[PDB]
Structure formats: C-alpha cells, structure tokens
Ligand binder design. Structure first.
Ligand SMILES: Cc1cc2nc3c(=O)[nH]c(=O)nc-3n(C[C@H](O)[C@H](O)[C@H](O)COP(=O)(O)OP(=O)(O)OC[C@H]3O[C@@H](n4cnc5c(N)ncnc54)[C@H](O)[C@@H]3O)c2cc1C
Ligand SMILES: [Zn+2]
Ligand SMILES: [Zn+2]
Ligand SMILES: [Zn+2]
Lengths: 734, 12, 20
C-alpha cells in the first residue's frame, strides 16, 4: 500500500494500467511501481508484460524491437508504460471551466480531440478536478517524474529523420515546405546562419531556463515543435492554443508540457525566432503578455534596422515612435519603379544566401518570388574579345593563391601590425614574380585587376584602406548558405510592409539625445522634443563618425575608437534603359558580365553589368562604381558618368552597334547627407570586435542597431534587419 | 564553439 | 566583406572548414 519511491506523497496508490487479470486496482500489491507522483502501476500488471509466461509479453517485445531499431534509450517496462498504456489527459475547452480530465484507457488523444474537448465527451464540467492535477505545478513534481516525456507525431519529426527521436524528445515508436527554411542542423553539418541544434540547448536558452540543464528533453521537444509550427505556417501569429493540440504525450506529464509551452513560446518570439518578419498584428493581438507593455521607445532612422525593431516592439505591445531624417522611409533601400515593367534598386537588391535568411521568410509571407543567379559571368575585354577560358582559370587560381598567403601571413599579427590588404597583395605578387621568374601578359594582369576590383566592390573601398587582418572577419561566424538572388520586386516591398501602421515622423532629423534624466530627451534639428524611456539609434556609420548627433553624456572613448576603426564604404550604381536587348547575342542569357579593366586605376569603373530583367524581355542594365573610380566620379555630373558608361559599353560590344539609352539614373549616396555611404568595412588597424562594441547598449537606456553593428552579418539589409530584432529583444527584456 | 551558434540565441 | 560578392566570388584565404 505504499510507493517504492522515497518521499512520494502517494498516500493512496491506484493502478492506471489494469491490464493484468490480477490487477491490485487500489488494494495491496507486493510493490507499487512509480512513474510519477500521481501515477503508479501494480506489481501484478508489471509482471503481465515483464514476464515471458503472461499475455502482455507479445506486446512488450514488438514495441521493444522498434524502440531499439529506431531508438537510443533503454526500453524499460516503465518506458513501455509511459509510451503505450498511460492514459491521456485533456483540458476542457469551455472558457469558464478549463479543467483537466483523464480520458479512459482506450481513447487515443488527437489534436482534433484536444482542440474541441469538453468535460464528458448531468453538468459534466462541475465535477471536481482530480486533485492530482494541481499537483503537477509544484516545482518538485517534475523532479519526481521518473522518465522524461517524449512527444508523439511532432510536426518537427519529418525535419529530424536523421536523429534518434528520443534525443530530440520524440517517441521512437512513431513514423511542401519552402526550400529555404532549414532551421535545424543535421548531424555532422557545416555551419550555417540561423540554425539551431535540435538536440542541444543554445546559450540564451540555458540562461533563460536554467532548470533544464540537468535534463533538456522536455524543452527541446517543445522548442523544436514550436519552430516547426512557425515554419509550416509563417503567415499567422503562432499562439499557445495552436500549439497545445500538437502536444501528444500520455499521462499527467502532458499537463506540465502545455504549461511550459507558453513560457517557451514567449521566449522564442521575444528573441525573434518566431512571430516575426512581416507579420502584422494588433491591437488585442499583441505577441507578448501585458507584463512587457508598459514602456516606450524612440527609434531613430527608418531603414531596415529601425523598421525591424519598430515592427517587433509594436507587435510585442510596446509603444514605439520612429524619427526619420529624410522625406522617405527605407534608407539605403530605395527603389526606382519608373523603368518599364522592371524594378531597379538605387540601393540594395541582392540577397546573399537565402537559406534561413529572414528576407526569404518575408518573401514567403508576401508571396514574392526571387530570381536565383546563374554561375556564368564572362570577362569581356575592350573591345569585344571574351577572355579565353584557360586564361580566366589561371588568373583566378593566382588571385586566390594571393589571398591564401595573406591568410597565412596574418595568423600571428596583432592590430598594431596590420597592413592594408591592397599593399599586402601587391607585395606578395611582386615577391612571387621575383621568386619564380614567370611572366604574365598585359591581359593576365588586367584579368587580375578585375578580381581586385571585385574585392573593392565587396568592401566598398579601395583595397589600400582595408585591413589585411580583418577584411573577412565575419566568416569566423557561420554564414548564410544557399542561393544568391535578385530580389526582383525590390526590398521596398518588405520595407513598406514592415512600416505599415507604425508611428513614423518623416523630415525629423535628430540632433540631440539627452539620457541624463529620468527618461530620454530627443530633439530634432528644428527643436521638436520627443521623450521616451528608451532610445534606439540606427543611423549609418558615417553619421556617427561625423558626430551629427550630440550625445549627452558623450559616447565613451571606447565606442568612438570602434566607430572610427570601421570604414564608411562606398559604391555607386548606374542604371540604363535601352530600346532593345542589344547584348543577347553575345551574353546569351547570363545574369551579368564582367568588364576587364584596361589599367589599375580604371578597375572600379563599371566592373560588372547586371541584366535587370530575369525574364529576358525588357532591356535594363545596371552597373557599379567601386574603389578609386568613385573619387574620379565625384566632380562629374550625371550626363558625364553616362557618357563614360556608354563609351565602355561600345568598347565592350566593339563589333556591333549599341542603341542610345532612353532613361537612366546615377546614384549619389556618397553625398546624401543623412547617409553618405553604401556599407561598412574594417579599416586597417581594426577588428570585427568593433561591431560588438558599437552594438553595446549604454545603461540599458541607449541602444544601437544597423549593418555597422552586426558582427556576424555586416553590410547587408539582412544584417541590418537582424540587428533591429536583436535590439527589440533586449529592449523588451527590460 | 561560437562558429555554429544561432545569432539570436547567443546574445548571452 | 567577401559575403558581399555574387558575380565571381573569391574563394581563397578561408579558414579550415568546420563540422559538428
Ligand atoms: C548602392 C547600394 C547597394 C547596396 N547593395 C546591397 C545589396 O545588394 N544587398 C544588401 O543586402 N545590401 C546592400 N546594400 C546595403 C544595405 O542597403 C544596407 O546595409 C542597409 O540598408 C543598412 O541598414 P540600416 O538600417 O542600418 O541603415 P539605413 O539604411 O542606412 O538607414 C538608416 C536610416 O537612418 C536615417 N538617419 C540618419 N541620420 C538620422 C538622423 N539624424 N535622424 C533620423 N534619422 C536618421 C537615415 O535617413 C536612414 O533612413 C547596398 C547599399 C547601397 C547604398
Ligand atoms: Zn509514488
Ligand atoms: Zn495493475
Ligand atoms: Zn469542463
């Protein structure tokens, strides 16, 4: 009449299985077996499966063979009981009852049953709640559960077929998603951005839920399921009521699961893992409980970063106001929709690695399609000659060889010993010609300058200003896998959508941020005052270098050093519309073509041309000004820049006619006063650590976001976006 | 190993 | 940063690839 287990408050054990002809029911038995505080089975029923001469040995062995060919844990009899015989419990759906009930032995719980259940499926709802239900929410209850719960038919299961279900918190006795959603690592896999381990908790999870470091199974099953639900339907807010029905496990443990799913769900949304992207919501639809709502924030700048954080905080239930200096939202996302049936970005338009990219998520949510680039990119000389495939392969080989040795040279150098990448390449190159008396033609040298300029484009600067040590610092961290895409409708759709329904003040350049008093005083250049409890700055790096905002108290010297160790990198775009697709014969449907430079100084002058209609019907070309060439273009007017582009094209297509363009634009980001750059890079002397230091909040009061604050993913719209999500999460925590 | 960590769940 | 490259991605100078 007492439990085997030490310190069980089972003052009256009953047998849940009643499978043996001799069940003790609620009587005396040689030994009561304990599965939980409220769950026990009798020695006779124990024997009914455990011993070979009884009727339940057939069952026990079939299950046991499966649990081994599909599992990694011990197939103990207590495990068979918890997986196969323990009754289910389901909570009444009637708003005013909400009581938990035991279903009878033979009923198999399904989501449909959980969705709709009501007591008695007399006033059935008025019968008292089995007292064992309250018992489940005592901290010690879980400590006295023998085995950890394993979920049945988890939505996560199809995505986890490479793991043992029990290691990911699922039952071994079990068994059309967007190709870019790959939220779980596979076992023995290369690093990729925004992937979680399904079988290990990550640092913020261990921090938030310390109680699961002893045993992470319950958390992992619930976290994995939640993610898989989010990714199966990313167009709706994912809520506890949509989760509960998909939690299928026997016994009172299921009651502990649905109580935890809430806490986990709110953690996941705060951190921006689910219920994010372009999901709009409100008012009585806020994603985080009343508990986070009472607070206010001012966000400065309405580009991807500021809009990300604004969207998140607003969805959370928090009061947000955004102050934008310009007469438009978007920042360095600025789309031209005036070309015939083609959208051309003056700023951002490529998505670099789509797998697990939030931009690919948002394209889902919006039903937008992206054009994946082809690999081909011929290197056309002036005037006409496509570069020999062998010559192209030789110079590519050497160029990357030079990068290898730069990488070998840097391993023992400190910041105080940094040299510019440009210098360290030329040297190694000159050292190499000397060493081995090979001679390159004028052409092979020009092909080298193409690659060199292509690095200049990536960095947004001449190679003589960029750190050899730290130019590719971010590749320390896992990077976005998969396709590079043309975002054909433009990033402006995502922007417009994130901004929809938020409080945005345009033409309100901020000048003063005072964080001395009880709350933050923000003052525009015309003297308009705003105040809030928190402030988030997302202005571009170059504006922080020019000190365009007065900070009171001043930013630390440690911050200024980081701010100044990064470059405000720059590129300019030219776009040209033509009467017809003059390049088709020669280019043959390739997405872009290269322009081999005639000389080192001219290398950043339209190095690559992008065909802007992936449907290959309209005729729009885009090209880029990088490196030295940005300097040489600052005094020239738009028409003069055009002329050089046209002269370049007529050299590239020397043996044919090229039409006159019928419309164009030339970008002047460099002299946009609230922007003054294209993207950040590490100047010589710097470290990637500078991104983290800029990212550090001040006094849990002043926060920073933007591409120049994201160490993992600098430069990009994506990087900017994720920095806004990071800060919204930190702001909501407080 | 910091290389693998999910960006949003590594803000300790 | 190298990650900005689409057309004609540079390959050299990477760290030894990492697996779980
Ligand atoms: C030509 C070009 C090509 C690019 N190519 C790509 C690409 O292909 N793919 C890609 O991912 N990225 C690309 N980028 C970079 C990408 O656009 C940026 O990384 C991203 O926009 C930066 O985000 P942000 O939120 O941090 O800042 P921003 O976009 O720069 O916006 C900052 C906002 O702050 C505002 N602001 C500044 N000062 C104040 C102030 N005092 N008060 C109020 N508001 C202020 C600005 O007006 C702006 O609205 C490109 C950029 C350019 C310019
Ligand atoms: Zn007991
Ligand atoms: Zn029994
Ligand atoms: Zn009821």
């Amino acid at each position: 009449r007492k439990c085997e287990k030490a310190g069980c408050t089972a003052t009256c054990p009953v047998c849940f299985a009643s499978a043996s002809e001799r069940c003790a029911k609620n009587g005396y038995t040689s030994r009561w077996y304990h599965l939980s505080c409220g769950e026990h089975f009798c020695n006779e029923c124990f024997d009914h499966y455990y011993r070979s001469h009884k009727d339940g040995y057939d069952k026990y062995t079939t299950w046991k063979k499966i649990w081994t060919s599909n599992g990694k844990t011990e197939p103990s009899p207590k495990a068979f009981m918890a997986d196969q015989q323990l009754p289910y419990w389901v909570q009444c759906t009637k708003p005013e009852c909400r009581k938990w009930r035991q279903l009878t032995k033979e009923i198999q719980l399904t989501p449909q049953i959980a969705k709709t259940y009501r007591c008695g499926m007399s006033d059935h709802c008025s019968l008292p709640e089995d007292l064992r239900v309250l018992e489940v929410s005592n901290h010690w209850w879980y400590s006295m559960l023998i085995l950890p719960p394993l979920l049945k038919d988890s939505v996560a299961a199809p995505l986890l077929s490479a793991y043992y279900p029990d290691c990911v918190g699922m039952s071994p006795s079990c068994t059309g998603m967007n190709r870019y959603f790959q939220p779980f690592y596979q076992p023995n896999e290369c690093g990729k951005a925004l992937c979680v381990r399904p079988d290990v908790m990550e640092l913020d999870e261990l921090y938030e839920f310390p109680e699961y470091s002893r045993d992470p199974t319950m958390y992992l099953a619930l976290r994995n399921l939640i993610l898989a639900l989010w990714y199966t339907n990313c167009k709706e807010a994912l809520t506890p009521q949509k989760c509960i029905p998909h939690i299928i496990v026997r016994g009172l443990v299921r009651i502990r699961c649905v109580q935890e799913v809430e806490r986990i769900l709110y953690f996941m949304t705060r951190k921006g893992l689910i219920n994010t992207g372009v999901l709009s919501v409100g008012a009585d639809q806020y994603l985080l409980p009343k508990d986070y709502h009472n607070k206010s924030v001012i966000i400065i700048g309405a580009g991807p970063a500021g809009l990300a954080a604004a969207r998140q905080l607003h969805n959370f239930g928090i009061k947000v106001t955004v102050l934008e200096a310009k007469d438009r939202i978007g920042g360095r996302v600025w789309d031209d929709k005036s070309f015939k049936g083609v959208t051309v970005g003056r700023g951002a338009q490529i998505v670099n690695g789509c797998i697990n990219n939030p931009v690919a998520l948002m394209c889902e949510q919006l039903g937008i399609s992206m054009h994946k680039f082809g690999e081909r990119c011929d290197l056309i000389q002036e005037g006409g000659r496509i570069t020999d495939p062998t010559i192209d392969k030789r110079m590519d080989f050497h160029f990357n060889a030079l990068l290898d040795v730069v990488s070998e040279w840097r391993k023992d150098k400190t910041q105080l010993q940094d040299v510019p990448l440009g210098e360290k390449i030329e040297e190694i190159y000159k050292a190499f010609i000397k060493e081995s008396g090979i001679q390159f033609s004028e052409l092979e040298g020009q092909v080298l300058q193409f690659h060199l300029s292509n690095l200049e484009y990536a960095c947004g600067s001449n190679l003589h200003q960029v750190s050899a040590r730290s130019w590719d610092h971010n590749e320390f961290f896992a990077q976005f896998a998969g396709d590079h895409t043309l975002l054909t409708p433009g990033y402006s759709v995502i922007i417009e959508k994130l901004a929809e329904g938020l409080d945005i003040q345009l033409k309100s350049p901020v000048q003063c941020i005072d964080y001395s008093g009880d709350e933050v005083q923000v003052t525009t250049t015309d003297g308009t005052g705003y105040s809030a409890q928190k402030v988030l700055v997302t202005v571009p790096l170059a504006l922080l270098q020019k000190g365009a905002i007065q900070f009171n108290p001043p930013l630390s010297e440690k911050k200024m050093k980081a701010i100044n160790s990064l470059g405000a990198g720059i590129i300019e775009k030219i776009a040209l519309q033509f009467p017809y697709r003059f390049w088709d014969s020669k280019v043959q449907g390739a997405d872009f073509f290269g322009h081999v430079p005639p000389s080192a100084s001219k290398r950043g002058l339209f190095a690559v041309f992008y065909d802007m209609d992936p449907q290959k019907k309209h005729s729009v070309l885009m090209s880029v000004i990088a490196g030295e060439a940005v300097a040489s273009v600052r005094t020239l007017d738009d028409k003069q820049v055009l002329q050089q582009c046209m002269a370049t094209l007529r050299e590239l297509f020397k043996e044919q006619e090229v039409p006159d363009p019928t419309k164009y634009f030339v970008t002047r980001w460099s002299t946009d006063p609230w922007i003054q750059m294209a993207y950040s890079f590490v100047k010589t002397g710097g470290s990637g650590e500078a991104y983290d230091i800029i990212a550090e909040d001040i006094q849990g009061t002043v926060f920073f976001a933007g591409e120049a604050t994201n160490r993992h993913f600098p430069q990009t719209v994506t990087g900017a976006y994720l920095s806004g999500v990071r800060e919204a999460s930190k702001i909501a925590a407080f | 190993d910091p290389h693998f960590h999910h960006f949003l769940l590594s803000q300790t | 940063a190298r990650t900005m490259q689409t057309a004609r991605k540079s390959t050299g100078g990477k760290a030894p690839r990492k697996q779980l």
